[PDB]
Amino acid sequence: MNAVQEIMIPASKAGLVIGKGGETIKQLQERAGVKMVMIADKPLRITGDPYKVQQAKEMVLELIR
Numbered sequence: 001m002n003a004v005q006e007i008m009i010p011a012s013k014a015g016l017v018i019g020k021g022g023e024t025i026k027q028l029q030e031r032a033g034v035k036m037v038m039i040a041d042k043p044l045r046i047t048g049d050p051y052k053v054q055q056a057k058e059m060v061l062e063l064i065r
Contacts, residue, residue, distance in 0.1 A: 003053040006043040013064040014042055028063070032056030 009017050018025045018038070029036050034048030034056045046056045 002047050003050040005046045005053050005057050006039070007046065007057060007060050007064075008041040009038070009044050009060075009064060010041050014038065016064060017044060017060065024063075028056070028059060032059055036060070 016024065017028075019027075025036055032046075032048075032055055033052045034046050036044055036046050036056070039045055044060060046053050046060070048056070
């Protein structure tokens, strides 16, 4: 069954996660093999295979650092 994990994204970083046209969040979904959607700091909801969600969490946190 899918894991669901939320990363809180500061408002100032939201555009960076999504990117122009959504091209950054599309790349992130392809590279990590999960679904990511946004829900003040905004939750990014990551859904997928439990192993892929853990890696995707690290990839997103590293990007927004």
